[PDB]
Amino acid sequence: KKVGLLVMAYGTPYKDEDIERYYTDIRHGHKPSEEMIADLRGRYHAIGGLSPLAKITEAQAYGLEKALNDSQDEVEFKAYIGLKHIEPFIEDAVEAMHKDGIEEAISIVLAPHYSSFSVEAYNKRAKEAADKLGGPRINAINDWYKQPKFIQMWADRINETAKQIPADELLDTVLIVSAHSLPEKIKQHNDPYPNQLQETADFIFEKVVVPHYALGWQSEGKTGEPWLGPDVQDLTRELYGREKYKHFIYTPVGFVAEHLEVLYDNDYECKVVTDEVGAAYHRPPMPNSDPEFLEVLRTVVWEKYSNLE
Template identity: 35%
Template sequence: MCSRVEAQRRARASEREERRGDVSGLKGVLLMAYGTPEHLSEVEPYYRDILGGREPSPEAVATLVERYRAVGGGTPLLEITRSVADLLEQRLNRDGGDVSWRVYVGMKHWHPYIAEAVKSIVADGLDELVALPLAPHYSRMSTGGYRDAVKRSMAQASSSQPTWFIESWHANPQFTALIAQRIRDALVRSNAAPPDVEVLFTAHSLPARIIDEGDRYPEELAESAAAVAQAAGIASWRFAYQSAAKTGTPWLRPDILESIKQIAREGGKNVLVVPFGFVCDHLEILFDVDITAKRAAEDLSVRFSRIEMPNNSPDFVEALYDIVASGAGARVVGLSG
């Protein structure tokens, strides 16, 4: 399997070089995600990286190891992101005209790090770069971390090409339509009448102090959920946060488990979770939603389901193409030039 994947990558690299000889410009896209350990032995150093080099407690490491063990020892985050990168590169070059595109993958907290990707970008001599975090909604704490990592890595690598950072893209019409269609498909699969299904949008919680700091994260989530619900024809829906860390300080609420309890108290029998703050199957989906939230719902006799994630689906790749090629529904800032 590994040899076949490497052979495919070498073939694509050869195609890139051949294509560059026929074009007048070379542009790139840096797709970024949070990162994930590929083996249980990597959980502790991965956790240490998240904490900025501080040592996590043995208890915290053990808890995270058990979560990864519960989903099979790892998640497909890196594999999916690489697949999206390959498909997006093909899509960009299909209509690229006299410009050739290359798409790179960089992770915030594990290999391949953003800095590693930037080194490859500099070596390839791009004329222009678009940096795109695979997180639809902006927060200074989360999305801003990607921006800072790109700027820091570019400075370290003496990178000088014009670089555009897409800090928010939830309003892209194709992304909105994609999530709306996922909701409609899930409602069909549920065999329940739509009015009898509680639609619960979720996104990653963050420390509550971001509100005092003027972060628009909650407002972007509310706007995005309303747009998706309207596109899906959903008149009634709820929103909750998920995956809050245990830091001893308040995090944004309501939490998904609180919302499920509220649905049960109100006599609800079906809940459809829509984790629209995420785009692929990783720990926050496979464990926090599919195991923890599902168990909580079933314990309360509430039938649980969730939408399929965008992952590397053609409609998601097309949405990313639209964001990169036209900037539709995106907020873009320049990092250099």
């Protein structure tokens, strides 16, 4: 008997024509205006037309399945992809697990940090789906940024970039560690997300040769409420004003793949600012399906499985 591996991620439009219904899902079912739709479509156009997130997410889910199954023979894992905002939805994945006779599953979100807005919603939807179906039992992983191989992965990528910076400009180099912003109100109830990002930045910092670092947030939404900051664009300007850094290295460690909110919100919007101030822009490769990242996820899931049994 197999163990279901429910791999959850945000989702991305497969076709240009999917953007409207995808955006409507993000907006809790309320259809955005033509102006809002045009702006989002323009951002997808600016990164090449569509996001590669769908193919990367598949490569991560099935690469994880293979890493687990090749490394042991206590159990057979079978991966099921469940997405937040487009088919196959979380609910579709849980239904396929049930139809296939899966009775026990482990779930993981392709985002290493926990928050009430992100991972908690994934877990709630998966559990409510399985409850209405009668199975499988879903054993949820909430976060995994503490995994040492995850920290070392990011540190290695940062050090490889730092080694190509002129030795006498390393003192003028800063590491910007970021993740997707959320409404500032989550701080009012001690949601762990801001502290988990600070811990990740601290863990990475002690393993890199870059002498300066700062925590920032990116991709805040179109609401009328305050969001966690500073925003990476605003922080870049402020740090240049204060310290005149020559190199900015962006690691949006809240994310695990190259998608719209790295290819646009870092590689376009942050580079606009470094260009304005006369500094150099650096953004190390995202984890994607690199074997080192697949080994991070394998360690996480296998530790979870070993602790259930």
